[PDB]
């Protein structure tokens, strides 16, 4: 049958197997078309983390289901502010993993702290890409235009946007 396997970047990869198909084989497959070795892989269905020995039917899994796949890094504070004439805004977010529906999770790897400003008219154009993907990847740097990226089923749509200097 087919299942849905959802990663924490908006990607929904497709995957076909058999109940008899073990939790050690599924996750090896996945690694076999999306680069992540299964070590870095956690699946959770129905909040139950699956285990590498149990059986897909054990966890009662049938066809057309949706599994959550997680990222296990072997290795704090995203802030957005807008501040001007009438007042000022602030949204503060932190990396977490959701359990009921992880596709809502916030991933973050920080190599250096970043502190950058961007024109809003540009960002307003950019968020339109919501309509192509559940999730968006965002890459920031002091040395180069920031990348924003929605993935398609095989391909993608990218927005490079230069920060302001002053």
């Amino acid at each position: 049958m087919q299942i849905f396997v959802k990663t924490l970047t908006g990607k929904t990869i497709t995957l076909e197997v058999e109940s008899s198909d073990t939790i050690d084989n599924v996750k090896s497959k996945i690694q076999d078309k999306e680069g992540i070795p299964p070590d870095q892989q956690r699946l959770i269905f129905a909040g139950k983390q699956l285990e590498d020995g149990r059986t897909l039917s054990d966890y009662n899994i049938q066809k057309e289901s949706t599994l959550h796949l997680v990222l296990r890094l072997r290795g704090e504070t995203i802030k957005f502010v807008a501040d001007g004439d009438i007042g000022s805004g602030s949204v503060i977010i932190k990396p977490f993993v959701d359990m009921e529906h992880p596709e809502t999770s916030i991933k973050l790897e920080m190599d250096q702290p970043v502190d950058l400003t961007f024109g809003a008219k540009y960002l307003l154009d950019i968020i339109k890409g919501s309509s192509l993907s559940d999730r968006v990847g965002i890459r920031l740097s002091s040395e180069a235009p920031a990348l924003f990226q929605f993935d398609l089923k095989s391909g993608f749509l990218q927005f490079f946007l230069a920060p302001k200097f002053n």
Partner: protein
């Protein structure tokens, strides 16, 4: 000799949304391994880049690289004929003057042939992505959507901080 069939015209209709609103023109490079597209905004601060693979079409066949720069505003019009779940199909010849767009839906139900006349746009493809970025985050696209949307009310300049 391009013939490229989206199973649903919604998709391509969506993708072109991305360009509309912030870029007038775009070269489309069709290749045997699919379509890719680049356009720079006018102030040269924003670059839109698009990659679509063979696996994204119902069928795709293009035995020879062809470039189509097209007026987006023109092309979108043509894309309103879309209805969203019809089978769109792009078609082109060896040296193309018009790309043909071709919608049909459920059965022989309905069929509608359109032509967009192509324009000469000079190909200056940019390759601007870095190997390493200071920071990387992903988050629900509509969460982001919401944030940008709110803070745009207060200020022309949103600023991001990671720590």
């Amino acid at each position: 000799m391009l013939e490229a069939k989206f199973e649903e015209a919604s998709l391509f209709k969506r993708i072109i949304d991305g360009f509309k609103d912030c870029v007038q023109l775009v070269n489309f490079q069709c290749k045997e391994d699919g379509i890719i597209a680049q356009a720079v905004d006018d102030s040269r601060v924003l670059l839109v880049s698009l990659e679509i693979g063979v696996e994204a079409f119902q069928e795709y066949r293009c035995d020879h690289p062809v470039t189509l720069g097209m007026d987006l505003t023109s092309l979108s019009k043509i894309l309103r004929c879309g209805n969203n779940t019809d089978t769109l199909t792009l078609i082109a010849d060896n040296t193309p003057d018009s790309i043909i767009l071709l919608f049909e839906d459920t059965k022989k139900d309905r069929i509608a042939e359109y032509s967009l006349k192509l324009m000469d746009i000079d190909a200056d493809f940019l390759k601007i992505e870095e190997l390493q970025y200071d920071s990387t985050l992903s988050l629900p696209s509509s969460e982001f959507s919401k944030i940008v949307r709110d803070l745009s009310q207060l200020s022309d300049s949103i600023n991001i901080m990671i720590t």
